[PDB]
Amino acid sequence: SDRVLQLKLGNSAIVTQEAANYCCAYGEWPNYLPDHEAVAIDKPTQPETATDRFYTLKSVKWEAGSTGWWWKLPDALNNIGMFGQNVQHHYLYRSGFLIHVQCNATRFHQGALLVVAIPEHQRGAHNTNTSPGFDDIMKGEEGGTFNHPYVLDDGTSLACATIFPHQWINLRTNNSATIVLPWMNAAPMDFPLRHNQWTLAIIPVVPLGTRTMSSMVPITVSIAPMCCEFNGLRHAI
Amino acid sequence: SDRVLQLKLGNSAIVTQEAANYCCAYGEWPNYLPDHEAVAIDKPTQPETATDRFYTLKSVKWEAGSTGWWWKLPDALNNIGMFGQNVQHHYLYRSGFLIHVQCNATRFHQGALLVVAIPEHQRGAHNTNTSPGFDDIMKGEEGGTFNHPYVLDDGTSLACATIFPHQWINLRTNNSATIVLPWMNAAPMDFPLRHNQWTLAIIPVVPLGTRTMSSMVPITVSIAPMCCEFNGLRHAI
Amino acid sequence: SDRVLQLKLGNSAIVTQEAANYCCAYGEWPNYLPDHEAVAIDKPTQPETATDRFYTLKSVKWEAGSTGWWWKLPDALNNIGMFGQNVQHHYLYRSGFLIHVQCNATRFHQGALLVVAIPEHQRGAHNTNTSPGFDDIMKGEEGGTFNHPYVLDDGTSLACATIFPHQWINLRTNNSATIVLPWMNAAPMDFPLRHNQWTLAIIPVVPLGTRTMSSMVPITVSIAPMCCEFNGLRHAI
Amino acid sequence: INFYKDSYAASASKQDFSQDPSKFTEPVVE
Amino acid sequence: INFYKDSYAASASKQDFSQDPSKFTEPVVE
Amino acid sequence: IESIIKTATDTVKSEINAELGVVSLNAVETGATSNTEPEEAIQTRTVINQHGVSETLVENFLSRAALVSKRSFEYKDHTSSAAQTDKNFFKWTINTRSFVQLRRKLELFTYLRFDAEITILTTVAVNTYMGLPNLTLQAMFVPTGALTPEKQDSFHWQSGSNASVFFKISDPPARMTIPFMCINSAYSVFYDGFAGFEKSGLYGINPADTIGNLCVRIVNEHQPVGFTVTVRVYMKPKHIKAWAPRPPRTLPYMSIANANYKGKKRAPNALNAIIGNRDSVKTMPHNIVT
Amino acid sequence: IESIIKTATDTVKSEINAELGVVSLNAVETGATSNTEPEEAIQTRTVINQHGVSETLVENFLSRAALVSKRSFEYKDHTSSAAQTDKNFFKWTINTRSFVQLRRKLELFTYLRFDAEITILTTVAVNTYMGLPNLTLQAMFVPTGALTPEKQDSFHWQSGSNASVFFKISDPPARMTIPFMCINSAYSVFYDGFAGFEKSGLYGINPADTIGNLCVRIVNEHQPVGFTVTVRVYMKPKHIKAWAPRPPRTLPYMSIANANYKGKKRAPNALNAIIGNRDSVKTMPHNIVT
Amino acid sequence: SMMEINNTESAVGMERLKVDISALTDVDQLLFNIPLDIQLDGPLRNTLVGNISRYYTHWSGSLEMTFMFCGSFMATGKLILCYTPPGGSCPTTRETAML
Amino acid sequence: NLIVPSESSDTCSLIGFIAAKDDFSLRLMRDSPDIGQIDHLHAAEAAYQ
Ligand SMILES: CC(=O)N[C@@H]1[C@@H](O)[C@H](O[C@@H]2O[C@H](CO[C@]3(C(=O)O)C[C@H](O)[C@@H](NC(C)=O)[C@H]([C@H](O)[C@H](O)CO)O3)[C@H](O)[C@H](O)[C@H]2O)[C@@H](CO)O[C@H]1O
Ligand SMILES: CC(=O)N[C@@H]1[C@@H](O)[C@H](O[C@@H]2O[C@H](CO[C@]3(C(=O)O)C[C@H](O)[C@@H](NC(C)=O)[C@H]([C@H](O)[C@H](O)CO)O3)[C@H](O)[C@H](O)[C@H]2O)[C@@H](CO)O[C@H]1O
Secondary structure, eight states, rough: OOOOOEEEEEEEEEEEESSSOEEEGGOOOOOOOOTTOOOOOOOOOOGGGGGOEEOOOOEEEEEOOOOOEEEEETTTGGSSHHHHHHHHHHEEEEEEEEEEEEEEOTTTTEEEEEEEEEEEEEOOSSSSSSOOOOOHOGGGGGOOEEEGGGGTTTSSSSSTTTGSSEEETTTTSEEEEEEEEOOOOOOSSOTTTTOOOOOOOOOOEEEOOOOOOOEEEEEEEEEEEEEEEEEESSSSS | HHHHHHHHTEEEEEESBBBOOOOGGOOOOOOOTEEEEETOOOOOBBBBBGGGEEEOOOOOOOEETTOEEEETTTTGGGTSHHHHHHHOOOOOOOEEEEEEEEEEOOTOOOEEEEEEEEOOOOOSSSSOSOOOOOHHOOGGGGGGEOSSSSGTTTTOTTTHHHHHHHHETTTOSSSEEEEEEEOOSSSBBBOTTTTOSSEEEEEEEEEEOSSSOOOOOEEEEEOOOOOOHHHHHOOOO | OOOOEEEETTTTEESHHHHHHEGGGGGGOOOOTTTTOOOOSSBOOOOOTTSSOOEOOEEEEEEOOOOEEEEEGGGGGGGGGHHHHHHHEEEEEEEEEEEEEEOOOOOOOOEEEEEEEEEEEOOOOOOOOSOOOOOHHGGGGGGGEEEEEGHHHHHTSSGGGSSEEEEETTTTTSSSSEEOOOOOOOOOBOOOTTTTSEEEEEEEEEEEEEEOOOOOOOEEEEEEEEEEEEEEOOOOO | OSSSSGGGGHHHHHOOEOOOOOOOOOOOOO | OOOOOGGGOOOOOOOOOOOOOOOOOOOOOO | EEOSSBBBBBBBOOOOOOOOEEOOOTTTTTTTTOOOOOHSSSSSSBBOOOOBBBBGHHHHHHHSSSEEEEEEESOOSSSSSTSSSOSEEEEEESOSSSSHHHHHHHEEEEEEEEEEEEEEEEEEOOOOOOOOEEEEEEEEEOOOOOOOSSSTTTTTGGGGGSSEEEEESSSSSEEEEEEEOSSSSEESOOOOOBBSSTTSSSSSGGGGGOOEEEEEOOOOOOOSSOOOEEEEEEEEEEEEEEEEEEEOOOOOBBBBSSSOOOOOOSSSSBBBBBSSOBBBOOOOTTTOOO | OOOEEOOOOOOOOOOOOOOSSSOOOOTTTTOOOOOOHHHSSSSSBBBBOOOOOGGGSSHHHHHHEEEEEEEEEEOOOOOSTTTSSSSSSEEEEOOOOOSHEEEEHHHEEEEEEEEEEEEEEEEEEEEOOOOOOOOOEEEEEEEESSOOSSTTTTTGGGGGSSSEEEEESSSSOOEEEEEEEESSSEEESSSOOOSSSSSTBBBSSSSSGGOOOOEEEOOOOOSSEEEEEEEEEEEEEEEEEEEEEOOOOOOOOOSSSSSOBBBBBSSSSSSSSSSSOOOOOOOOOOOTOO | OOOOOOBBBBGGGGGGGGGGEEOSSSSSOOOOOOOTTTSOOOOTTTSSSHHHHHEEEEEEEEEEEEEEEESOOOOOOOOOOOOOOOOOOOSSSSHHOOO | OOBBTTTSSSEEEEEEEEEEEEEEEEEEEEOHHHHHHHHBBTTSSSGGO
């Protein structure tokens, strides 16, 4: 009941069947921006199935000395599909996200994945007073790697990161995490190229371990934007 | 009453005020594809204001020995704006068009423009048995020039081209033509990169003439796609 | 409808027919001073058609290097007709004004006239600490010329002078401006020889230009005092 | 709050939300 | 007590006892 | 049509227009501003706009307490000082034109009717240091043209009928409301004329619009040492009615007696160039580099 | 389900459970916290729990007046002082990040909407002793990026439209409420991005979340001796709405511009050891000796 | 109120309040551009919307730009006036700005 | 194109206006950067005489 899950958005579908009951972030489902919260007065484009569909990223190799992986949203998707084209042709952006993180292994493998969506993950740099630059933050579809995931690369803590919307991929129990993110910003819409509302963080709290045949175990991230709005149509940036 | 005209689509607006009462092609207004005529069963994207908006092409110089200009639709727009991105990311396409052709000059200038939208303008080549190639037909945003506009480059006639949806720009009377085209195909939708439903033809039946100061007189084509549908979402071609 | 206009006051009439819909200053029409705002207790003379009639001033030559023209009211009219005699024989004065500014040229001429009525146009002098004298301000029927019309000769701006009651004479569109001024003073009545409630300013924002035969283009100012009251009858000053 | 006997003594009157911008934006007659 | 004309001027509002901890403790759907 | 506006207007959703008849194209030459709505220009959405408009109320825009006078004087023995010096007292004809932030705000209008809330801050500095005296000051309101005192111990300071306020430096600042005093229903912020029957009077200055005089002394006899006493007068207009808005002052003010202008030497706010220059009309001044 | 909670919940008595079916064993991997009640884990009694929860209200947890700025400067003659020195005046861009107790409390949340109650304490020390002057200070609120004064007797201190507060050292501390000022519905306590359209802007700093500027001068002319004047600014957030709680800061703060981290050299709060070490996982750190 | 779009050198005084357009011999040509931050110095600053806004810090709401053509009656022509929402550089070609 | 006959002026002018609409709002009142002084104005001392 909690394991079986079917996720159809647009022309994309995902059947995960070793799932663990999906996370709706703060009990909030994505919606379109209502008229009493709206600011930009032009009629938005809501591309629906052209953008509200699962975008699979490049898989990362879960390895023995791995620290963690992060992707920033919408930045991981700003150059993919018709979502990326609506991002590049519009000033404003608003959507929710359906994040589906996939990692299976054998029944002889051990390993726990904290799959956590962090709102406004302002990254700190280590051992310096200089703030992280544009290239450290805006990695795009490739994402980044955690430097010190124990303090979540911001001087706080991995241990208290369960205050954020999260699931776990414990290789005993499940092979997929599913987080549903709403719009998470102080503003109604946003310029999607200079601001990230959510950071999907995927962290090896318990490392991958087995004594069976060593296979490449990947972690696959599929992200569906949900309820996309785009205001301020112009030329492509 | 017939002269004043206001054309608002999306974020685009056109006020022409020396117009001559716009042509609705075959008395038909563009609509979305209804369910009883639909074929492709996936939910189409209907981008609305992201695509249903005026696209201005490059202006052409109306000159003394000019023969004519043609643009093929959707091919003139398949690489412009969010219409071009929806064209490049989808297999199927259906829209109507609002064509607004603009050419003014002084009250001392003379000249008549047959502005005619030709459905399925299968172009013939002159003085050869070889059919026109891909490069002769698919000019894109630049359009083409009529070789023999008196037979409409297909062995027929300029003189009977008023059977097609047309207006005139007689420089006495008006400075703008406005043709509203519906979907004009034997099929409900179409692959927009290999088939052109309409050809906007703009032909000097009476040449530009004056005895005042010679200015560059341009002909400006603004085309609004109307009721865009796009089926078969995939990667960009 | 907006172009045709007929202005009958007293024995004077003006038919302008290239007008642009007359300005009523602050949406206020001239009235006589009511009893609940009245101060001077003697019965005023209200000469009606003897004073409430168009007074045409001397025309000014609109020329290529012209800066602007100003007339101060009531000072431009204090020595004209029966208005001037009622001004010279009474201490107190109150009226509105109907200002009709006239300037036509050919359909080959270009030029824009900001015709603006400025309340309490306290003129500044340029490049000095000394205030303007009596002779700089009180020009009478001849009026004055703007020194620096870009700052309206008071260190402010031509560009924001549309906050005042104004019309334009764009030689394309119209040949006449018409501003209806009410009484505009902190006091109910006023001594008309030492205070000007309104300044009609007429400024070449776009200069006169043509390539046809150069004719003298004049600007003709016709001012009708409206609802004249005069208190404090005595000898002529 | 005002304990003075003159009404001009009171605090500022920041309560007049009546606007008529048309006397500056549309001072035309037709 | 507030004698200022702006509502932000008031004292702190220590009266909101509404809790929804389940949006952090049970953000699940089933 | 006059209406009560507490928030900015809502945007209604709009659709595609293709109409031959009624018009984004207006008539400038009538002097009217464009009434083109965004619903008629682009294709809009519904926005319920909850943005308040109260901070641009003229009452809020002008009821800021602004510095109108700032006078330092020596508080000392003035047996052997110059006849120009403020000898433990100054007089000040109340104007709103000496300090340019309040001046440009009030000169946004032609007519103003307001009560003048007058706040008086006094600071003292020793001219070695032995401490600051808690001095009593007298500020006496004197009408325009009336008799002002000529020395510190003048018998005009008795204030039989002039309003005087006594206040100490350790106290909060002295605060009085001067009413709307004009013989007219509004002050003339600009006065296009002479307020005298001969032709030698001052242009631009109507003494009806002068509030009055602040005659400010130190009530104390002088100390054995000297002090510099700076009196700052603050005016808050209140119960404000404003009429006939004007172009704002662009050029720097030259004088308080008039609207004379010089401009700065270069753009911005020069005589022939109010806005700072760009290279061409197709040069974008802060173009985003990508 | 959202509900009003004024006290901690009561415990119901429970009995012996021996059931084959419904579960003390939950699902961590869903991201949900254990809903196991003590009634279901042990055999409980009835406890009517009257413990209030009002002190952990976010309004009470954050409406403490906290030191946000502490600036000393010389109050003296500054004819011959360095161009770095505060020459009888300082400006301060209002931040909540310079003092780490308030910073960590506000950084417990992602979004905060609050009005800022600003309290200003001024202390003065003589730089021999002759007494302390009751000085008048001006604190002028200036918006983010706007013009701040450049000297002590600047004409920007006239405050035609800027709010200024004048206050004396002998008075109670100056106190103003700054509203919730942000162009957004909340401040972003953390800002994951750049607030500029080019790629050279600062990371983590949204100027929408900057309250503004406190420009604090001494209004007095300088005394013949010098004084050190320490201005302490206190901010109490009020009318607080807080969104999206975060892990608390564990490592020491390095800067106010960012969330950069170093940790301490050893546990506790080191980069690789937040909690202080014990010998083994089966070593009890404060084991009772009997 | 009048924008000072021609805020260039050699444009002296009143010449700054108009933009001279001429006949061109190339198509789709840029004529002028306008920076749009009303809180800054530029063609919008000495306007009624610009000067009052610079007494304030925060602003919301739509703007209208009205352009009056002041050629002759015989002068004809078509312009396209494009507002581009922010993000990248100012558009320099017509086919980029009409998007 | 701007297309004029021989006796029209070949260069034409555009006057641009800007207004705000009625959805316009202004917050956070500050001193204007458009006016300033670094001295006292002329005749301001005469108010003390
Ligand atoms: C501060 C900053 O980030 N950049 C400065 C540039 O803006 C500056 O370039 C000059 O900027 C000037 C700005 O125009 C105003 C303004 O601040 O809005 C226009 C005001 O009306 C004017 N005020 C008065 C009372 O005249 C004001 C004033 O002149 C300045 O504050 C004086 O410094 O300027 C203007 O556009 C100039 O044309 C432009 O060159 C550069 C200097 O090149 O310095 C940067 O620090
Ligand atoms: C005071 C007392 O009764 N005993 C002291 C021992 O506790 C101390 O042993 C060290 O105690 C440390 C306590 O951990 C904290 C704390 O006070 O809770 C953890 C805090 O996060 C940390 N604060 C910061 C800002 O880093 C705090 C801080 O480091 C200390 O106050 C600095 O002195 O410490 C910790 O567990 C150590 O690992 C442990 O050795 C002994 C010293 O051995 O001194 C006793 O006086």
